[PDB]
Amino acid sequence: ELPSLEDLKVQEVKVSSSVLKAAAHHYGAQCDKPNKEFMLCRWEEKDPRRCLEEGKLVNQCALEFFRQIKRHCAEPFTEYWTCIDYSGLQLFRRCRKQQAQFDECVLD
Amino acid sequence: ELLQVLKRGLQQVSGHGGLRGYLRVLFRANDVRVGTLVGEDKYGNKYYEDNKQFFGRHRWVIYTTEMNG
Amino acid sequence: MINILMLIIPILLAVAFLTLVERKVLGYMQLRKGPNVVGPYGLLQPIADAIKLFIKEPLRPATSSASMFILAPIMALGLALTMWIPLPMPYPLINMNLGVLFMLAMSSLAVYSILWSGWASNSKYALIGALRAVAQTISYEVTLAIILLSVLLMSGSFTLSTLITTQEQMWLILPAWPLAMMWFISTLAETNRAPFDLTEGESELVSGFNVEYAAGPFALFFMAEYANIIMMNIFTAILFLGTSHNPHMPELYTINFTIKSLLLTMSFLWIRASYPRFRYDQLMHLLWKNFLPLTLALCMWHVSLPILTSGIP
Amino acid sequence: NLMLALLTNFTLATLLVIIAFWLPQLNVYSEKTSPYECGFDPMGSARLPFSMKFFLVAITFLLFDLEIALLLPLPWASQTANLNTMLTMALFLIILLAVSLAYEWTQKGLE
Amino acid sequence: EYVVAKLDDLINWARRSSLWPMTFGLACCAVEMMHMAAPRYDMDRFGVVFRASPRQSDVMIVAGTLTNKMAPALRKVYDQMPEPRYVVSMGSCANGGGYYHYSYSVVRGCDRIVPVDIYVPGCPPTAEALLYGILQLQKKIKREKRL
Amino acid sequence: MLYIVFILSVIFVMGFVGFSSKPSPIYGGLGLIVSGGVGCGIVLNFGGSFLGLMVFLIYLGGMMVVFGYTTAMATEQYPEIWLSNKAVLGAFVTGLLMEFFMVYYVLKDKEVEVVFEFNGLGDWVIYDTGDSGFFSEEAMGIAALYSYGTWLVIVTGWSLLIGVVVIMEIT
Amino acid sequence: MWFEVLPGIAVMGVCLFIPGMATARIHRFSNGGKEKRVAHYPYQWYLMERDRRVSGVNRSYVSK
Amino acid sequence: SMVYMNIMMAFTVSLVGLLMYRSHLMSSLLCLEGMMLSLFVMAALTILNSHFTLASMMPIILLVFAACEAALGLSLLVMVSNTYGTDYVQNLNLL
Amino acid sequence: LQAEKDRRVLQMLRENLEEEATVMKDXXXXXXXXXXXXXXXXXXXXXXXXXXXXXXXXXXXXXXXXXXX
Amino acid sequence: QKRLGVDLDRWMTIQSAEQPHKIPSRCHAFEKEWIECAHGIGSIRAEKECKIEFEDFRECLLRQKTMKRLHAIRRQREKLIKEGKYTPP
Amino acid sequence: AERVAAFLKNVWAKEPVLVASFAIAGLAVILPTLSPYTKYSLMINXXXXXXXXXXXXXXXXXXXXXXXXXXXXXXXXXXX
Ligand SMILES: NC(=O)c1ccc[n+]([C@@H]2O[C@H](COP(=O)([O-])OP(=O)(O)OC[C@H]3O[C@@H](n4cnc5c(N)ncnc54)[C@H](OP(=O)(O)O)[C@@H]3O)[C@@H](O)[C@H]2O)c1
Ligand code: SF4
């Protein structure tokens, strides 16, 4: 069958917690070029074994995305993150008042 | 109108007995009401009267505890 | 799991404390004093019936049947008390993939309690009260699903969680004006304490699912039959009432939800005292002949509305 | 769990029957009767057909209940598919049900 | 010792609390038996709830005249009652014929058919006097099960 | 404990024996509730709450119509218990040997079957479906549709018109 | 009089009040943050499964 | 594969049930809905495992037609009792 | 979606090590080429093959409609 | 069909068609091969050329080829008791 | 009037619920064809994506850009 290497792709992969990813839809706008090329590779060639090299760049850019938010305007990001987990899965409902504190700091 | 209705209930509990007296007229007695009393009766009956309320009614009256044996 | 056990024992008490309201409100409706002697306002009498009917009352039927009969009060409680689980509330016990489908299926399964009580006595006297209970329920199951569909297409999907969020500004009584009036009648499909009702009360015929049963099974039937009345009252307060949601404070929802349901809880006992029984034949003529063309015309109307003006979840 | 939620309610319900079954016991005489409710000896022993009266109206329910089940897509299906193509088909099932009930008006039955 | 003695009174408290009557529409006594449901003299949820059906009820009130045509009918109804049962024969007909007694059809005193615990003597049984028929019933229930 | 559907499938066949071994349409009527209701759980565990609870809506409602002819027409003579008759119990005792003796071969190794296919164990393989879809998930998640099968809507509408008119001619 | 009726309503304002509060206030002990996650469809189910897998280990739903 | 073998075994018992007749005619109409119940479970598992989405509409159509025959046969049961007294497989005139 | 494929690859490598450990002496199992005769598309189908051992992890992964937390 | 439909079509019958919304079949990878092999008349009538692709299609829905393979692994793990045991998980 | 006004009041007198069964159900067919708002509801129904977006290879294409906020294809802007 020929399986992938035991070393695996992307060192220290994925974020530590869920919902955190769902709270920020800005990942669609920023860093899309590595994401879309992996997407274009995967639909044309259905094998995960062939387009894992492009998938390495997706996870590497994912770590670069979260580190920028942790450096500048971290306190409005944490307050928005605690708001979404307090409720069930409203995603954008009720937390729109605390969403005003967010984005405005990021706009700087 | 609403203030006088709540005050009428509080005055009824304050007039007859007090704290321990009101509980005796609630747990043992079915309906609690205060007014005029005749007083004098054999064994120890209370016998209350002179109340308006409704037609064919002459207050609580009440039964005595341990009448003969 | 603790939540299920905290939804049977306090709920059985609500069916117990119903017996007060069943003759206190109904009493003042008939200008007579209800519970008074037993407790401070007769409050010790509802809990006294549990000591009265179970511990001391012993009957089992004569000619009887085999395993069935005693199977029926198990079917009475074990299908009507399970109805509390899919309820949305502030927060539901295991939120269903589709909400109202489980509510409609188990309600029709709860009808079997009065059905298996027909074969409780092999004698023909009991099954007349069962055969009457068939038609007084079988016809009203048609509209119960149709009037639901007109409300469900108006707001969200089958999920009961979405039905709370859809009512943020105004109630669903005002858009569904003739449909809300239908759910004072269609709710009384199950054998409930009402004027429309079914073959359960005495009045003219012998008492259905009571003449065959004892005290102990017969006592278990009332703990299920009156339980369905609260269930329909809550279910109307979800589909037609709402007022506010508030996910942050559950305290503001729990008080406001109970008042809306309690006003409806009085309303069925208001119906019970006021009006006579509709007769076996003529209840089949209220619906089917007269109300079914009306509900389907409104069902036709509620199909067009999301297409006319955008209304898709 | 759905299984643990349903069984705990069912086991508590059947346990309450046992409490009312074993505690009250003293004597069981040949006293219990077949019909009860009104009294006297049962003239109609065991079982007899009776039947009729509602035979047509009951049958129609079995026929109608399938259509209401086929109406259940309406709030759940109309999300991805085109509305203009659906409008002609969704109403079509409701229209024909009124036609069947219109044929039910010309002699409904004994009920 | 003390818990056992008080538990027997707790079971007897349930019969002291509530007892469901039977609507024996037997004679004129049954009309005054309907006056127990009438508001002016009420036992409605004071300790009495009308529901009928001999299988569910605890107390049966024989309300009037019994005949030889009715002697087999009432007997098995008493047998259809749960074992803790009380019979209140209300009226002179229930106690041995109002007049009658020396008549051909009327059975004398109900006690020939079914045993009675509490007697009410009143022809037109005044609702005032009828109230004892349930209040004395509760007072008579004192002790059950010693061993 | 690992098996969820397999234990329910035993109860499914259990109610089905009370059909070949005729127990009258009251004890045999119970089968459509007992094995029918558990039969919904077989559908529910695989997925799709709609089609799983769709069995509850008709096979209980339509059974009430059947119940409208259990206390009617023919069967009202004797209850006829499946534990009393010698001709009935003989079919049940051989009926249980068609089910319970089969489970004896399931435990340890693959079970012996009349068909060519082997049963094996299959605990994790019982689901045999990956996650794949997320938003608007499940094939049963968007099951019923008026689109694509437009011809199927017309004939179903026709067949439910025919019956109402036809039964009127019979009666 | 309503002074007899209102204790019949007030006793219902305690027993029927329980199932609402008992479901909500139990989320403090069961989960960290007084919330039980809604499942519905596999998308929301997968988010819970990866949360329990990622450094929460034993806990089903946990922040960070 | 594994789950299919149990519901196929339930089909065979209901197959015999439609071919076995004793006294009443009511057993057949239970088995008609019984056999359709066993086919419905078989259809539900086959379509959902190897996902179809389009063909998951098909058992819903099948479930409609499942009681289409059952309603007509149950209405035919009514008219036999009117001509005779009680519906019996044992009681027939035609040769 | 990458997180799905990251887990599926790691599960495959765990299965490859288990097959080599169990089969060594008498039994014939190559594991190469796999079951499919096509060997060009190579479908994942990690539901029946995924997790060969440990009951607690397998039961949670298989059931989603059941329990539904 | 004894008589076929012209102009108007009432298809949506065969596997791997235009999906209900967008969701594809679980066996869609093997479904595509069967249409590509049997589009010509002299393939299914011959039933020899498409024998390779039909056997791969049998593996998808029934999973019988994978069932007997996974049965051998689970049996050997149960057979080896108290002698040679490994548990990486 | 022969049947427009003369026969309509006869339905109101005997069995008046029959009037509502024809009028409300009748308007449910006429309104979705003539009213100029029905086409807007289908537009949002097609715009709402259920499945994930698919990337296509670009080789001389018009109205196609990056995922970032730019004028590409069409993009829904019908009422806010
Ligand atoms: N098996 C038979 O049928 C059989 C065969 C051969 C001979 N016999 C003879 O026939 C007689 C049948 O009588 P039985 O057994 O039918 O009577 P039983 O049912 O035992 O009834 C006797 C009653 O007397 C009371 N009693 C007796 N001893 C008591 C004590 N020490 N303290 C308080 N109360 C007491 C009991 O009241 P409590 O329940 O309130 O204590 C009980 O209700 C026997 O005496 C026997 O010699 C019987
Ligand atoms: S005792 Fe008097 S009132 Fe009672 S039934 Fe006899 S005659 Fe009538």
PDB file of N, CA, C and O in Angstrom, chain E residues 17-54:
ATOM      1  N   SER E  17     -57.684  11.247  56.211  1.00  0.00           N
ATOM      2  CA  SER E  17     -57.529  12.364  55.277  1.00  0.00           C
ATOM      3  C   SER E  17     -58.624  12.385  54.208  1.00  0.00           C
ATOM      4  O   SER E  17     -59.374  13.359  54.112  1.00  0.00           O
ATOM      5  N   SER E  18     -58.710  11.311  53.418  1.00  0.00           N
ATOM      6  CA  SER E  18     -59.626  11.243  52.276  1.00  0.00           C
ATOM      7  C   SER E  18     -60.246   9.862  52.083  1.00  0.00           C
ATOM      8  O   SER E  18     -59.568   8.840  52.220  1.00  0.00           O
ATOM      9  N   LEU E  19     -61.541   9.856  51.767  1.00  0.00           N
ATOM     10  CA  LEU E  19     -62.295   8.643  51.437  1.00  0.00           C
ATOM     11  C   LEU E  19     -63.274   8.942  50.306  1.00  0.00           C
ATOM     12  O   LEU E  19     -64.063   9.889  50.394  1.00  0.00           O
ATOM     13  N   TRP E  20     -63.216   8.133  49.249  1.00  0.00           N
ATOM     14  CA  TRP E  20     -64.069   8.327  48.076  1.00  0.00           C
ATOM     15  C   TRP E  20     -65.382   7.539  48.184  1.00  0.00           C
ATOM     16  O   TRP E  20     -65.351   6.315  48.347  1.00  0.00           O
ATOM     17  N   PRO E  21     -66.534   8.243  48.107  1.00  0.00           N
ATOM     18  CA  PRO E  21     -67.847   7.600  48.204  1.00  0.00           C
ATOM     19  C   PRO E  21     -68.327   6.980  46.889  1.00  0.00           C
ATOM     20  O   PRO E  21     -67.771   7.268  45.824  1.00  0.00           O
ATOM     21  N   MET E  22     -69.352   6.135  46.987  1.00  0.00           N
ATOM     22  CA  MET E  22     -70.026   5.560  45.824  1.00  0.00           C
ATOM     23  C   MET E  22     -71.398   6.192  45.626  1.00  0.00           C
ATOM     24  O   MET E  22     -72.171   6.328  46.581  1.00  0.00           O
ATOM     25  N   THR E  23     -71.691   6.565  44.382  1.00  0.00           N
ATOM     26  CA  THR E  23     -72.945   7.244  44.034  1.00  0.00           C
ATOM     27  C   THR E  23     -74.102   6.254  43.855  1.00  0.00           C
ATOM     28  O   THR E  23     -74.594   6.042  42.740  1.00  0.00           O
ATOM     29  N   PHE E  24     -74.524   5.652  44.967  1.00  0.00           N
ATOM     30  CA  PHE E  24     -75.672   4.749  44.988  1.00  0.00           C
ATOM     31  C   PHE E  24     -76.970   5.538  44.832  1.00  0.00           C
ATOM     32  O   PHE E  24     -77.507   6.075  45.806  1.00  0.00           O
ATOM     33  N   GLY E  25     -77.457   5.613  43.595  1.00  0.00           N
ATOM     34  CA  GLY E  25     -78.720   6.283  43.285  1.00  0.00           C
ATOM     35  C   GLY E  25     -79.890   5.368  43.580  1.00  0.00           C
ATOM     36  O   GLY E  25     -80.615   4.964  42.666  1.00  0.00           O
ATOM     37  N   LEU E  26     -80.074   5.055  44.862  1.00  0.00           N
ATOM     38  CA  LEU E  26     -81.027   4.037  45.299  1.00  0.00           C
ATOM     39  C   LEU E  26     -82.405   4.560  45.693  1.00  0.00           C
ATOM     40  O   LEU E  26     -83.386   3.841  45.529  1.00  0.00           O
ATOM     41  N   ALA E  27     -82.474   5.786  46.222  1.00  0.00           N
ATOM     42  CA  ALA E  27     -83.752   6.413  46.612  1.00  0.00           C
ATOM     43  C   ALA E  27     -83.662   7.935  46.842  1.00  0.00           C
ATOM     44  O   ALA E  27     -82.859   8.607  46.188  1.00  0.00           O
ATOM     45  N   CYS E  28     -84.491   8.468  47.747  1.00  0.00           N
ATOM     46  CA  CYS E  28     -84.510   9.905  48.076  1.00  0.00           C
ATOM     47  C   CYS E  28     -83.286  10.321  48.883  1.00  0.00           C
ATOM     48  O   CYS E  28     -82.870  11.481  48.834  1.00  0.00           O
ATOM     49  N   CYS E  29     -82.736   9.369  49.638  1.00  0.00           N
ATOM     50  CA  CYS E  29     -81.487   9.547  50.381  1.00  0.00           C
ATOM     51  C   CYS E  29     -80.313   9.938  49.475  1.00  0.00           C
ATOM     52  O   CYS E  29     -79.426  10.686  49.894  1.00  0.00           O
ATOM     53  N   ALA E  30     -80.337   9.442  48.236  1.00  0.00           N
ATOM     54  CA  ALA E  30     -79.342   9.769  47.207  1.00  0.00           C
ATOM     55  C   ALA E  30     -79.357  11.243  46.782  1.00  0.00           C
ATOM     56  O   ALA E  30     -78.335  11.767  46.329  1.00  0.00           O
ATOM     57  N   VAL E  31     -80.512  11.895  46.927  1.00  0.00           N
ATOM     58  CA  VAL E  31     -80.670  13.328  46.630  1.00  0.00           C
ATOM     59  C   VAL E  31     -79.954  14.177  47.691  1.00  0.00           C
ATOM     60  O   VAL E  31     -79.275  15.149  47.352  1.00  0.00           O
ATOM     61  N   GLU E  32     -80.101  13.800  48.963  1.00  0.00           N
ATOM     62  CA  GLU E  32     -79.340  14.421  50.056  1.00  0.00           C
ATOM     63  C   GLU E  32     -77.863  14.021  50.046  1.00  0.00           C
ATOM     64  O   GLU E  32     -77.019  14.749  50.574  1.00  0.00           O
ATOM     65  N   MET E  33     -77.563  12.868  49.446  1.00  0.00           N
ATOM     66  CA  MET E  33     -76.185  12.426  49.215  1.00  0.00           C
ATOM     67  C   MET E  33     -75.512  13.299  48.150  1.00  0.00           C
ATOM     68  O   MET E  33     -74.294  13.487  48.175  1.00  0.00           O
ATOM     69  N   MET E  34     -76.320  13.828  47.226  1.00  0.00           N
ATOM     70  CA  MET E  34     -75.883  14.847  46.264  1.00  0.00           C
ATOM     71  C   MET E  34     -75.678  16.213  46.926  1.00  0.00           C
ATOM     72  O   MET E  34     -74.923  17.044  46.414  1.00  0.00           O
ATOM     73  N   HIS E  35     -76.355  16.439  48.056  1.00  0.00           N
ATOM     74  CA  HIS E  35     -76.194  17.667  48.845  1.00  0.00           C
ATOM     75  C   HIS E  35     -74.876  17.737  49.625  1.00  0.00           C
ATOM     76  O   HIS E  35     -74.509  18.801  50.135  1.00  0.00           O
ATOM     77  N   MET E  36     -74.178  16.603  49.716  1.00  0.00           N
ATOM     78  CA  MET E  36     -72.801  16.548  50.222  1.00  0.00           C
ATOM     79  C   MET E  36     -71.823  17.188  49.240  1.00  0.00           C
ATOM     80  O   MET E  36     -70.783  17.718  49.644  1.00  0.00           O
ATOM     81  N   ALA E  37     -72.164  17.115  47.953  1.00  0.00           N
ATOM     82  CA  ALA E  37     -71.431  17.791  46.886  1.00  0.00           C
ATOM     83  C   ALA E  37     -71.850  19.259  46.749  1.00  0.00           C
ATOM     84  O   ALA E  37     -71.090  20.074  46.218  1.00  0.00           O
ATOM     85  N   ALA E  38     -73.052  19.583  47.234  1.00  0.00           N
ATOM     86  CA  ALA E  38     -73.575  20.953  47.237  1.00  0.00           C
ATOM     87  C   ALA E  38     -72.803  21.849  48.220  1.00  0.00           C
ATOM     88  O   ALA E  38     -72.631  21.474  49.385  1.00  0.00           O
ATOM     89  N   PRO E  39     -72.338  23.030  47.745  1.00  0.00           N
ATOM     90  CA  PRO E  39     -71.413  23.931  48.456  1.00  0.00           C
ATOM     91  C   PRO E  39     -71.738  24.296  49.911  1.00  0.00           C
ATOM     92  O   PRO E  39     -70.813  24.369  50.726  1.00  0.00           O
ATOM     93  N   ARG E  40     -73.018  24.518  50.226  1.00  0.00           N
ATOM     94  CA  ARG E  40     -73.441  24.966  51.567  1.00  0.00           C
ATOM     95  C   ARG E  40     -73.016  24.004  52.684  1.00  0.00           C
ATOM     96  O   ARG E  40     -72.536  24.442  53.731  1.00  0.00           O
ATOM     97  N   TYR E  41     -73.190  22.706  52.445  1.00  0.00           N
ATOM     98  CA  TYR E  41     -72.676  21.673  53.339  1.00  0.00           C
ATOM     99  C   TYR E  41     -71.777  20.741  52.533  1.00  0.00           C
ATOM    100  O   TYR E  41     -72.249  19.799  51.887  1.00  0.00           O
ATOM    101  N   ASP E  42     -70.479  21.031  52.571  1.00  0.00           N
ATOM    102  CA  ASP E  42     -69.503  20.371  51.707  1.00  0.00           C
ATOM    103  C   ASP E  42     -68.517  19.463  52.419  1.00  0.00           C
ATOM    104  O   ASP E  42     -68.021  19.785  53.504  1.00  0.00           O
ATOM    105  N   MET E  43     -68.258  18.322  51.786  1.00  0.00           N
ATOM    106  CA  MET E  43     -67.108  17.479  52.096  1.00  0.00           C
ATOM    107  C   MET E  43     -66.188  17.341  50.877  1.00  0.00           C
ATOM    108  O   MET E  43     -65.245  16.541  50.888  1.00  0.00           O
ATOM    109  N   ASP E  44     -66.466  18.143  49.844  1.00  0.00           N
ATOM    110  CA  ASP E  44     -65.680  18.177  48.607  1.00  0.00           C
ATOM    111  C   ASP E  44     -64.242  18.619  48.880  1.00  0.00           C
ATOM    112  O   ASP E  44     -63.976  19.794  49.163  1.00  0.00           O
ATOM    113  N   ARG E  45     -63.336  17.643  48.799  1.00  0.00           N
ATOM    114  CA  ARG E  45     -61.910  17.774  49.156  1.00  0.00           C
ATOM    115  C   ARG E  45     -61.653  18.227  50.617  1.00  0.00           C
ATOM    116  O   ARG E  45     -60.554  18.666  50.970  1.00  0.00           O
ATOM    117  N   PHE E  46     -62.686  18.109  51.451  1.00  0.00           N
ATOM    118  CA  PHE E  46     -62.546  18.155  52.905  1.00  0.00           C
ATOM    119  C   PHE E  46     -62.187  16.749  53.390  1.00  0.00           C
ATOM    120  O   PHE E  46     -61.553  16.584  54.436  1.00  0.00           O
ATOM    121  N   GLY E  47     -62.614  15.752  52.612  1.00  0.00           N
ATOM    122  CA  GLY E  47     -62.337  14.337  52.863  1.00  0.00           C
ATOM    123  C   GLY E  47     -63.123  13.400  51.959  1.00  0.00           C
ATOM    124  O   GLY E  47     -63.061  12.178  52.124  1.00  0.00           O
ATOM    125  N   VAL E  48     -63.856  13.976  51.004  1.00  0.00           N
ATOM    126  CA  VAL E  48     -64.737  13.234  50.092  1.00  0.00           C
ATOM    127  C   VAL E  48     -64.580  13.751  48.656  1.00  0.00           C
ATOM    128  O   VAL E  48     -64.671  14.958  48.406  1.00  0.00           O
ATOM    129  N   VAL E  49     -64.316  12.827  47.730  1.00  0.00           N
ATOM    130  CA  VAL E  49     -64.251  13.124  46.292  1.00  0.00           C
ATOM    131  C   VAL E  49     -65.093  12.095  45.529  1.00  0.00           C
ATOM    132  O   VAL E  49     -64.796  10.895  45.550  1.00  0.00           O
ATOM    133  N   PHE E  50     -66.139  12.583  44.863  1.00  0.00           N
ATOM    134  CA  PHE E  50     -67.029  11.750  44.053  1.00  0.00           C
ATOM    135  C   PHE E  50     -66.364  11.369  42.732  1.00  0.00           C
ATOM    136  O   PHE E  50     -65.856  12.235  42.011  1.00  0.00           O
ATOM    137  N   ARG E  51     -66.366  10.070  42.431  1.00  0.00           N
ATOM    138  CA  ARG E  51     -65.744   9.533  41.215  1.00  0.00           C
ATOM    139  C   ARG E  51     -66.447   8.274  40.688  1.00  0.00           C
ATOM    140  O   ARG E  51     -66.286   7.920  39.514  1.00  0.00           O
ATOM    141  N   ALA E  52     -67.229   7.625  41.558  1.00  0.00           N
ATOM    142  CA  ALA E  52     -67.879   6.322  41.297  1.00  0.00           C
ATOM    143  C   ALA E  52     -66.867   5.197  40.998  1.00  0.00           C
ATOM    144  O   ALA E  52     -65.689   5.321  41.353  1.00  0.00           O
ATOM    145  N   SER E  53     -67.336   4.124  40.349  1.00  0.00           N
ATOM    146  CA  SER E  53     -66.589   2.868  40.108  1.00  0.00           C
ATOM    147  C   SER E  53     -66.155   2.158  41.405  1.00  0.00           C
ATOM    148  O   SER E  53     -65.272   2.650  42.117  1.00  0.00           O
ATOM    149  N   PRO E  54     -66.765   0.986  41.704  1.00  0.00           N
ATOM    150  CA  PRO E  54     -66.580   0.281  42.987  1.00  0.00           C
ATOM    151  C   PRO E  54     -65.155  -0.218  43.228  1.00  0.00           C
ATOM    152  O   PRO E  54     -64.796  -0.537  44.364  1.00  0.00           O
TER     153      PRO E  54
END
